[PDB]
């Protein structure tokens, strides 16, 4: 059976949700239970964490523009998604998506993480670039269980604090 | 690092390999030795193979119109691809491209298979509906692995020969 439905129009998808690709949901996944996770990711957004995804990670910016924060090579590096872009993320390359631009629209596509492979949520300090806090979790529901591992961080000042220089993390913005 | 390069304009790249997105070749994959295998196809061709997938198959028909001839529920059924379609297919729907329009260009998403997963082609008999011929096959390079395959069974009369029915395929094209 065609478990996922029939082809349809993308842009009149993405018009469609136009509501939900944009603050406090931001983005909105295309089809459920498939191997294929297939989301779809408006603005604005702004973070401070890095993913840290031990898959790859497709990107189609189809509207609008925007960044990647990266480490790479470690050092701080960004990559940018100019409207028109695609781009293959490696696996582990530590990334921040940051989505200045309402109206904006990325098609991102990854895989379900099988069952004991974890994927790792990390934040740095900006004034030594140290590794301040990482919490790895089994998403199976990332629309759900990252909201609570994200403001679990804000809230405590002991998993903000660097542990190298002492500077407490600002938590949800930089 | 970035194994897989910096993104980059993805229309822009379409027409610089528009050449390429016609016959003989057809196809282009857009990085190499990657988990996610990510191909643009062009037209025309017509083919008579049904391809069974393990793993999930992701399309987008950027440009021009393009179908899908299916298996499902044990019936013939055809999947239209039109302009701006996308779509997800699930693991082992037998399908068979079909792709009329020179200037096409359809983004395809496809997972490695692991060593142990085989991919199936098989062609079915227009008379009677009952499958003719299946070739399994350890897809590491499908642009060099397929066109033997393919050719093999256009060049015998007994793999195209029908077991229900008797009647031959006519191998190339229906
Ligand atoms: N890369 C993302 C993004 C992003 O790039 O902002 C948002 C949601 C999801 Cl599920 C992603 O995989
Ligand atoms: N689905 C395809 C097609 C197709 O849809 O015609 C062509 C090449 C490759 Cl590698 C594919 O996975
Ligand atoms: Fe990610
Ligand atoms: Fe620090
Ligand atoms: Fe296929
Ligand atoms: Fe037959």
Redesign the pocket.
């Known amino acids: 059976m065609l478990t996922y439905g029939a082809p349809f129009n993308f842009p009149r998808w993405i018009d469609e949700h136009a509501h939900l690709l944009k603050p406090p949901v ?2 909105r ?1 295309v089809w459920q239970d498939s191997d294929f ?1 297939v ?1 779809v ?1 408006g603005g604005p ?1 702004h ?1 401070t964490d890095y ?1 840290d ?1 031990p898959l790859e ?1 497709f ?1 189609y910016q189809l509207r609008g523009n ?1 960044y ?1 924060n990266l480490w790479v090579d470690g050092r701080r590096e960004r990559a940018d ?1 100019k409207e028109g872009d695609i781009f293959l993320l490696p696996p582990h390359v530590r ?1 921040s ?3 200045p631009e309402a109206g904006s629209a ?1 098609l ?1 596509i ?1 895989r379900q993480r099988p069952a004991g492979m974890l994927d790792g949520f990390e934040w740095y300090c900006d004034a030594c670039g140290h590794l301040v806090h990482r919490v790895e979790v089994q998403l199976k529901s ?2 759900t269980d990252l909201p609570p591992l994200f403001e679990s961080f804000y809230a405590s000042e002991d998993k903000r604090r660097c542990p190298h220089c002492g500077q407490v993390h600002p938590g949800r913005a930089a």
Chains 1, 2 share one sequence.
Do not use: M, S, Y
Request: glycine share 4%; charged share 20%; hydrophobic share 35%.
């Open positions: 931001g983005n996944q996770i989301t990711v957004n973070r993913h995804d990670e990107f925007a990647l998604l990334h998506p940051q989505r990325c991102v990854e990332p629309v």
